[PDB]
Amino acid sequence: QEALGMVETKGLTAAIEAADAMVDSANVMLVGYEKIGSGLVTVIVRGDVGAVKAATDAGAAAARNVGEVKAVHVIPRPHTDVEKILPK
Amino acid sequence: QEALGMVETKGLTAAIEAADAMVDSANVMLVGYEKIGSGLVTVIVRGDVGAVKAATDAGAAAARNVGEVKAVHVIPRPHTDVEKIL
Amino acid sequence: QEALGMVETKGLTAAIEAADAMVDSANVMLVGYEKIGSGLVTVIVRGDVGAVKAATDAGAAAARNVGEVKAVHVIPRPHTDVEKILPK
Amino acid sequence: EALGMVETKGLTAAIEAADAMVDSANVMLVGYEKIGSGLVTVIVRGDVGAVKAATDAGAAAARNVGEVKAVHVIPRPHTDVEKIL
Amino acid sequence: QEALGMVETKGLTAAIEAADAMVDSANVMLVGYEKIGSGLVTVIVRGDVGAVKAATDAGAAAARNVGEVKAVHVIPRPHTDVEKILP
Amino acid sequence: QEALGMVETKGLTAAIEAADAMVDSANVMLVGYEKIGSGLVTVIVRGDVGAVKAATDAGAAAARNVGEVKAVHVIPRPHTDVEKILPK
């Protein structure tokens, strides 16, 4: 029932906007962001699957008005150990 | 609670110039700059919404004369979670 | 030795998707993510060869719907030498 | 105390810039900075006139070795800007 | 003294494969790998000249099936200063 | 008169070859290598101007047979202070 949601941007400003836009719905928690170099930044949230889909949709839309979005994705997860697949 | 302002440049020189122009007024705090690769540098400031809007306009204006501006943005009230990114 | 599984993608998002399918599809331990530039991310797992083969197949398949998969590979018996190369 | 910068593509052009800069004027080398895309920034300090001459010279010199992407002088940088350098 | 071998790839998976192929023979030692950005990863080995030649050829052959080979090179007798740059 | 010599490559293997060739061909000491990301590596040597000139020429030619050379440069230096313009 609990998903992980991601917006990956090229540019930091757009990722910060994506993060802010996603948590605007109190139904989503920010886990954090990941940098992999080459200007690529990934923002990650968790919450109920439906909330996460809606949050990620809004976050991507917002980021695209600020900079470049490279990927938007939602991963449903198991009830225990939801974040154990995340880096760092 | 406090507004968030960002000027993101390609090039450090342009970013430092943006940083300098932004801190020119007293009610603006420079949080720092962030590097993410591909030459991309983001300067981040905090303050009252009005001060931050004016600072970021100015930072963007100053930087574009030195190098490439990639993003200029203000979030009047960032959510408390976003503070984990700064 | 415990086999090694690797899925390498362009973008972190496809890679997290891969990690999800991998540890979900078989008894593999997530070793970590590795960044090398040009947007390339490698997800690495460990386990017995059969589990790793199944996980790697699953990770690659899942990731191809999310982003570009650049490499998929299994080393059934890595050396200790090579394990000092790995993030563990 | 003025701030000077030469930003090049490639480290070699940058090191050439540092050489021309500290040779042609009374500037102190504060350091090098890398930001990706092959971009390296050389930073100097000194009185503005020295810094202006150094950056002019460093850029001219760096251009003989490689590509200069940015050149800039900040006569009086702010105190907060001093913590990011 | 010992010879130096390098297999440099674009892609990490390819580099790990090259490393595994090279250290398969007992007289070749893995010195380490280096990342320099742009996806370029270098695997470095030491051993007798002959072993290092066969090892690097094999590492490159293995790696090219997984990703891109960027450099394959052997230094029969490295000069000592060169060891001050190795991992 | 003491100079600084540099060969800058895209790729590490070509740089190691440049380094080896430089200290092998002339009475120059290897100062070190610098990575600035994006595959760019700079090898630096020190010695008399003639030696540094002979080394860098030999380093560039050797490296060009192994990979991509981006820059080759000799910097004559003052008597005192010869290495203080170097980074890190």
Side-chain angles (χ1 to χ4, degrees), chain A, chain B, chain C residues 1-83 85-87, chain D residues 1-75 77-85, chain E, chain F:
Chain A
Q1 69 175 300
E2 268 200 320
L4 284 167
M6 292 141 199
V7 178
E8 184 163 13
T9 64
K10 187 163 179 197
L12 178 61
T13 302
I16 292 172
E17 170 67 1
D20 188 70
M22 286 185 281
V23 299
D24 186 74
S25 77
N27 221 358
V28 154
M29 178 184 190
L30 179 66
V31 175
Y33 69 105
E34 200 75 27
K35 315 185 181 180
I36 67 174
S38 299
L40 298 179
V41 184
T42 303
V43 189
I44 309 171
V45 296
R46 67 181 292 186
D48 293 342
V49 178
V52 167
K53 285 181 171 293
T56 52
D57 281 342
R64 277 185 201 101
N65 291 327
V66 165
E68 196 182 348
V69 170
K70 285 287 180 175
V72 192
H73 189 59
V74 176
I75 310 178
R77 296 285 294 151
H79 311 37
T80 76
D81 281 0
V82 166
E83 292 177 17
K84 89 161 169 320
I85 61 169
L86 299 175
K88 296 174 182 176
Chain B
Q1 189 63 257
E2 269 196 320
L4 187 68
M6 292 149 288
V7 175
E8 183 164 11
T9 65
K10 187 162 177 196
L12 178 58
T13 302
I16 294 170
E17 167 66 2
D20 184 67
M22 281 183 275
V23 300
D24 252 341
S25 216
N27 53 351
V28 167
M29 178 189 191
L30 174 62
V31 175
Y33 69 79
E34 288 281 325
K35 312 188 277 181
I36 64 174
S38 297
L40 296 177
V41 181
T42 303
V43 185
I44 301 171
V45 294
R46 302 308 288 277
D48 290 337
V49 179
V52 166
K53 286 177 68 166
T56 49
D57 285 343
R64 75 188 301 272
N65 291 325
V66 175
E68 294 185 354
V69 170
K70 282 289 178 174
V72 52
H73 192 58
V74 177
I75 301 179
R77 297 177 44 123
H79 287 288
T80 67
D81 257 3
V82 169
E83 293 293 348
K84 293 182 172 74
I85 287 172
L86 304 174
Chain C
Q1 188 63 260
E2 272 196 323
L4 282 167
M6 292 149 289
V7 180
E8 185 162 8
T9 64
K10 215 112 170 156
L12 180 59
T13 304
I16 292 170
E17 169 69 6
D20 180 71
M22 287 175 95
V23 301
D24 182 36
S25 293
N27 199 16
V28 303
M29 176 188 45
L30 180 65
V31 179
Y33 299 75
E34 202 77 30
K35 314 68 186 179
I36 63 172
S38 296
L40 296 178
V41 180
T42 303
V43 191
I44 303 171
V45 298
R46 290 187 199 152
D48 67 74
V49 49
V52 169
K53 180 54 164 55
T56 293
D57 282 340
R64 81 184 204 289
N65 288 323
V66 176
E68 196 181 345
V69 174
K70 282 287 180 175
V72 190
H73 195 62
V74 179
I75 305 179
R77 311 149 292 271
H79 303 217
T80 69
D81 281 1
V82 170
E83 260 161 8
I85 235 185
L86 303 171
Chain D
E1 198 251 359
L3 194 65
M5 288 144 193
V6 179
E7 185 161 12
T8 62
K9 187 162 178 197
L11 179 58
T12 299
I15 293 171
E16 166 66 4
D19 180 73
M21 287 178 95
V22 196
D23 179 72
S24 72
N26 200 347
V27 302
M28 175 190 45
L29 179 65
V30 356
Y32 297 78
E33 203 75 27
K34 64 192 182 64
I35 63 174
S37 296
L39 294 178
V40 184
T41 303
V42 185
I43 308 172
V44 297
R45 296 190 135 302
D47 65 71
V48 58
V51 166
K52 179 55 161 55
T55 55
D56 282 342
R63 276 184 200 99
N64 294 322
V65 169
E67 206 167 340
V68 171
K69 281 287 180 174
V71 192
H72 192 59
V73 180
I74 301 179
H78 284 57
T79 322
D80 226 320
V81 172
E82 290 291 346
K83 324 180 174 337
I84 74 168
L85 300 174
Chain E
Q1 98 175 27
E2 275 197 323
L4 194 65
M6 288 84 75
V7 177
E8 187 163 14
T9 68
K10 186 163 178 198
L12 181 62
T13 304
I16 292 171
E17 168 67 3
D20 184 69
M22 285 185 279
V23 299
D24 249 341
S25 222
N27 53 348
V28 165
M29 180 188 193
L30 177 63
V31 179
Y33 69 100
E34 288 283 325
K35 313 191 278 181
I36 57 174
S38 295
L40 297 180
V41 184
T42 305
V43 187
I44 307 172
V45 296
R46 294 179 178 159
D48 289 333
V49 182
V52 172
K53 281 175 62 169
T56 51
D57 284 342
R64 77 186 299 269
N65 290 327
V66 171
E68 292 182 352
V69 171
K70 256 254 181 171
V72 193
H73 190 59
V74 185
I75 302 179
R77 341 185 298 114
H79 186 273
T80 320
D81 278 43
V82 171
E83 225 89 45
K84 293 197 325 178
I85 69 171
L86 301 177
Chain F
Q1 190 192 354
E2 271 199 322
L4 286 167
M6 292 142 197
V7 175
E8 186 161 11
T9 64
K10 188 163 180 197
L12 181 61
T13 302
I16 290 171
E17 171 66 359
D20 185 72
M22 284 185 279
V23 302
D24 184 76
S25 292
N27 207 345
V28 300
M29 181 188 340
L30 180 64
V31 175
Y33 70 100
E34 294 286 328
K35 313 187 277 181
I36 61 173
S38 301
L40 295 176
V41 179
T42 305
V43 189
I44 306 171
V45 298
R46 174 185 182 171
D48 290 339
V49 174
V52 168
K53 176 53 164 54
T56 51
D57 281 340
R64 276 183 201 105
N65 289 324
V66 168
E68 199 181 347
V69 171
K70 284 287 180 174
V72 191
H73 190 59
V74 179
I75 303 178
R77 296 283 295 153
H79 183 63
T80 172
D81 280 347
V82 171
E83 288 180 14
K84 250 181 168 246
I85 65 168
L86 298 177
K88 214 165 322 194

